[PDB]
Nucleic acid binder design. Structure first.
Length: 341
DNA sequence: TTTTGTTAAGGGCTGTATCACTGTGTAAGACAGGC
C-alpha cells in the first residue's frame, strides 16, 4: 500500500466531505460537488482523472432524457450489473434530505467523451424516509436481483421537529428495505437481531448476502464492534430475509472500502472514537458462507495524516482510495492523497 | 396690590457643527488560467 500526494486544478473547491466516486470501465467520475452546479458544469458530475499525481476535474454532460439530480452529500450508493450506479438519499445543498433514487449509466461514449444518463426511479410501497449515511447494495438470489437498504439518519418527524432543534438528527429505525428497481417498489422487514439504529457503517455484498460492519449509533453514542450478516432468499414472489450476528466485528464509523480482488476487500480509514482515528487497516476475505477479518500492515502515514482530526475519502475502484485532510496556517483548504493496494 | 412680560442694544458660557485627515470596508473594474 503506497501513499502518494495529489495536486488539484483550479476547481479544487468542488471536493467536499460526503462526495462520491463512481467507476465506469476504468474511468472515474466525481459527484456531489459543494454548492449548486454552476454554468461551468451544469450537471455536477465530473471526469475525475489523476495523471502523474495531478487531479483534473473535467465537466461531464447528461443525455437529453436525463434528470439533473441535485448534488448529494453522504448518499447511499451501489453498483448494478449494462453497468449502472444507484444513488439513494443524501443531503442537498439546501440541507434537505431526498427520498429519491437516481440511476447513473453511460448513455454515449464517443471518442472517449462520456455522456451520462441520470434517471429518477419512483418508489412505492414501504418507501424509506429521507436519509443520509445509510447503505444500499444489490443481492442476487435464485436468478433474481434485489436492492438491500439499511441504516442512516434523518431529521425529526414533522410532528416532533421544532425550530430550536431544527437540524437535530436521529438514527433511522433498523428496518431492512428490499427494493425492486424493476417494479419501483419497496418492502420493509423488521428483524429482531437489528435492535439499534446504525449509520456511517460499511456494507459488503456477495451473492445473496450483505454484511454490515462498524458504524455509529447516535442514541448510545457507540461505534459497536459487531458484524451482521443479512441473507436474502427470493423464492418466486415471496422474499425472505434472515440476519445472523457473527463475532469478530471491527468497531469503525465512516471507514472506506475498496475491492482488491474478487472475494477480498480492504477496509482503511475511519474513526474508532470521536477524538481518535482508526489508523490500522483490515483485510476481509470472503467465503460462500464465511467471512474473515484480518489485521493488515498499517500504511506509512505522514505526520499530517497522523495528527489530523478528520479525514474523508472515497473508493476509486481500482483498489485505490482517494483521501483528504484539512490544513490551516498560511495554507490550502484540503490536502489529498491516493492510497494504492 | 402682587406677579411677570416686554422693549432695545449688547456681553459673556455653552453646545454643536464643522475643521482637516487618514485608515479602511466595499465594490467597480481589470485580468488571466481553465498545465
Amino acid at each position: 500500500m503506497s501513499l502518494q500526494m495529489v495536486t488539484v486544478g483550479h476547481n479544487i473547491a468542488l471536493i467536499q466531505p460526503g462526495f462520491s466516486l463512481m467507476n465506469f470501465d476504468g474511468q472515474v467520475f466525481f459527484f456531489g460537488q459543494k454548492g449548486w452546479p454552476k454554468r461551468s458544469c451544469p450537471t455536477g458530475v465530473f471526469h475525475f482523472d489523476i495523471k502523474q499525481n495531478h487531479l483534473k476535474l473535467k465537466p461531464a454532460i447528461f443525455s437529453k432524457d436525463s434528470c439533473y439530480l441535485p448534488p448529494l452529500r453522504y448518499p447511499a450508493t451501489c453498483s448494478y450489473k449494462k453497468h449502472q450506479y444507484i444513488i439513494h438519499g443524501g443531503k442537498t445543498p439546501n440541507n434537505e434530505l431526498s427520498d429519491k433514487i437516481y440511476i447513473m449509466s453511460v448513455a454515449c461514449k464517443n471518442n472517449k467523451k462520456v455522456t451520462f444518463r441520470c434517471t429518477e426511479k419512483d418508489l412505492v410501497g414501504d418507501v424509506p424516509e429521507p436519509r443520509y449515511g445509510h447503505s444500499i447494495d444489490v443481492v442476487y438470489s435464485r436468478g433474481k436481483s434485489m436492492g438491500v437498504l439499511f441504516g442512516g439518519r434523518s431529521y425529526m418527524p414533522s410532528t416532533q421537529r421544532t425550530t430550536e432543534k431544527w437540524n437535530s438528527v436521529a438514527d433511522c429505525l433498523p428496518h431492512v428495505f428490499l427494493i425492486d428497481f424493476e417494479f419501483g417498489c419497496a418492502t420493509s422487514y423488521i428483524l429482531p437481531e437489528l435492535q439499534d439504529g446504525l449509520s456511517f457503517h460499511v456494507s459488503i455484498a456477495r451473492n445473496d448476502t450483505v454484511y454490515i460492519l462498524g458504524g455509529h449509533s447516535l442514541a448510545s453514542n457507540i461505534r459497536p464492534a459487531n458484524l451482521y450478516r443479512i441473507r436474502v432468499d427470493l423464492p418466486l414472489g415471496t422474499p425472505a430475509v434472515n440476519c445472523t450476528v457473527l463475532p469478530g466485528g471491527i468497531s469503525v464509523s465512516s471507514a472506506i472500502l475498496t475491492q482488491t480482488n474478487n472475494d477480498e476487500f480492504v477496509i482503511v480509514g475511519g474513526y474508532q472514537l470521536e477524538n481518535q482515528k482508526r489508523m490500522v487497516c483490515s483485510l476481509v476475505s470472503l467465503g460462500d458462507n464465511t467471512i474473515e477479518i484480518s489485521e493488515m500492515e498499517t500504511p506509512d502515514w505522514t505526520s499530517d495524516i497522523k495528527h489530523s482530526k478528520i479525514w474523508f475519502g472515497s473508493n476509486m475502484g481500482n483498489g485505490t482510495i482517494f483521501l483528504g485532510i484539512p490544513g490551516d496556517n498560511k495554507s490550502e483548504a484540503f490536502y489529498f492523497y491516493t492510497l494504492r493496494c
